[PDB]
């Protein structure tokens, strides 16, 4: 696609974050990537090691809509502290596998407590969304928000 509705540019891309309801109302035709402040309402699938990478599905909300998402392997590896290959190597060593089990629990807690900026790629053709990055809110975000509200 070689055109964009210019009247939605701020709606999709204004810092510090935008809204899922607004994205969906725009009826995107191509893969669209936005940043939202969101938390996980519930996990919707098991943590999988299929393909030699971590995956999990969850339903998130930004206060305006629900969205079912996948998380990139790198996020899950960072939260657990083990990649899939590392987990598989650890299994024969009780002390190493124990570190993995501790990481699993850490990941579980981290996903329960998650409330941050999520960069999300939404593919309207496949009705799929993938979380590409997570970022903690910071004072620049606060100032961005104040500026947007002219405060």
């Amino acid at each position: 696609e070689n055109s964009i509705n210019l009247s939605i540019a701020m709606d999709l891309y204004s810092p510090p974050f935008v809204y899922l309801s607004v994205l969906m109302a725009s009826k995107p035709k191509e893969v669209t990537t936005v940043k939202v402040k969101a938390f996980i309402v519930t996990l919707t699938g098991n943590l999988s090691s299929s393909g030699g990478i971590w995956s999990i599905t969850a339903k998130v909300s930004d206060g305006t809509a629900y969205l079912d998402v996948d998380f990139v392997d790198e996020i899950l590896t960072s939260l657990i502290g083990f990649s899939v290959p590392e987990m598989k190597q650890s299994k024969k060593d009780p002390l190493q596998y124990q570190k993995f089990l501790e990481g699993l629990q850490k990941c579980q807690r981290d996903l329960i407590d998650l409330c941050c900026l999520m960069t999300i790629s939404f593919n309207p053709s496949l009705s799929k969304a993938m979380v590409l990055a997570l970022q903690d809110v910071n004072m620049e975000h606060l100032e961005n928000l104040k500026k947007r509200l002219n405060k």
Partner: protein, 131 residues
């Protein structure tokens, strides 16, 4: 569980602007020149003032609100402690004289001071962007 999204709200909005009743709550937007905003689930934030079993009283800058059913919610970093700053996703049970929620989640936001300082702004910004 709720079909509609957990709208960000301040206690004052429920306390002052909510209409209807159980299963048919509306947020009046007459002053803002818009129609009623239907609400069932909400996203609220505040400081824990009191906690006793699975019940808590929380305080946002606009007022207090009560939360029940906390024994049922996912167990993240423990935050049912007076002084903690937390978020709740809840289903609205009552609005006036004090808003009351049935909890879906309660999670800790105490570690990062930016959350508390951003909340009022977040509520305003979200409400500016609902038709």
């Amino acid at each position: 569980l709720p079909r509609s999204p957990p709208l960000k709200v301040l206690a004052e909005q429920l306390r002052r602007d909510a209409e209807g009743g159980p299963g048919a709550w509306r947020l009046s937007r007459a002053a803002a020149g818009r129609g009623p905003l239907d609400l069932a689930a909400v996203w609220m934030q505040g400081r824990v003032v009191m906690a006793d079993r699975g019940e808590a009283r929380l305080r946002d800058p606009s007022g207090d609100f009560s939360v029940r059913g906390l024994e049922r919610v996912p167990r993240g970093r423990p935050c049912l402690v007076p002084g903690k700053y937390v978020m709740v996703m809840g289903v609205v049970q009552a609005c006036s004289p004090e808003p009351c929620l049935q909890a879906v989640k309660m999670t800790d936001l105490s570690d990062n001071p930016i959350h508390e300082s951003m909340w009022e702004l977040e509520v305003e910004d979200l409400h500016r962007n609902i038709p």
